[PDB]
Amino acid sequence: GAMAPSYRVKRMDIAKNDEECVVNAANPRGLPGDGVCKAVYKKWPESFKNSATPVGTAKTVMCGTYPVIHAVGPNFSNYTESEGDRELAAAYREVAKEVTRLGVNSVAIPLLSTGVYSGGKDRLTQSLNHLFTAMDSTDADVVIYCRDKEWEKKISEAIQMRT
Ligand SMILES: [Cl-]
Question: What is the 3-state secondary structure (H, E, C) of the chain?
């Protein structure tokens, strides 16, 4: 556990994180995929051995001694808003369990279901709030990774509003 568990946000490639483990925005099949998933595949390809896992779950595979937590958010193209929201909250709960089990002091995490799986909607607040619901009871330092300046601003504001 971190001495003073915190949330932070950084606008950079999650494949260049400075934390003790990473959460992949995985697909259910363990495929190299696109976006965050493709970056994670290029950086830690060994972590895709038997990484396939259902929607709403997380499966950890080691790359060397570096844990990759493959978290499978729903594709809102396919899910109803209601069932998609349940599966998205469940994926983050499984991430919290894995972060705790591993005993890490820090984790790098993307906002699940906010890219190709968003079904063309802005899901920053929905996804971030499920992340907080799951991770608030953990003592790891959480570092959220994003790409766009206006996402960075909004995520930073949301963290600060609770502090
Ligand atoms: Cl996504």
Answer: CCCCCCEEEEECCHHHCCCCCEEEECCCCCCCCCCHHHHHHHHCHHHHCCCCCCCCCEEEEEECCEEEEEECCCCCCCCCHHHHHHHHHHHHHHHHHHHHHHCCCEEEECCCCCCCCCCCCCCHHHHHHHHHHHHCCCCCEEEEEECCHHHHHHHHHHHHCCC
Cα of 39 vs centre of ligand 1, distance in Å, is: 13
> Which structural technique was applied?
X-ray
Is 117 flagged in the annotation as binding?
Answer: yes
Q: Is 105 annotated to bind ligand?
A: no
Amino acid at 115: G
Q: Where are the domains of the chain?
A: 1-163
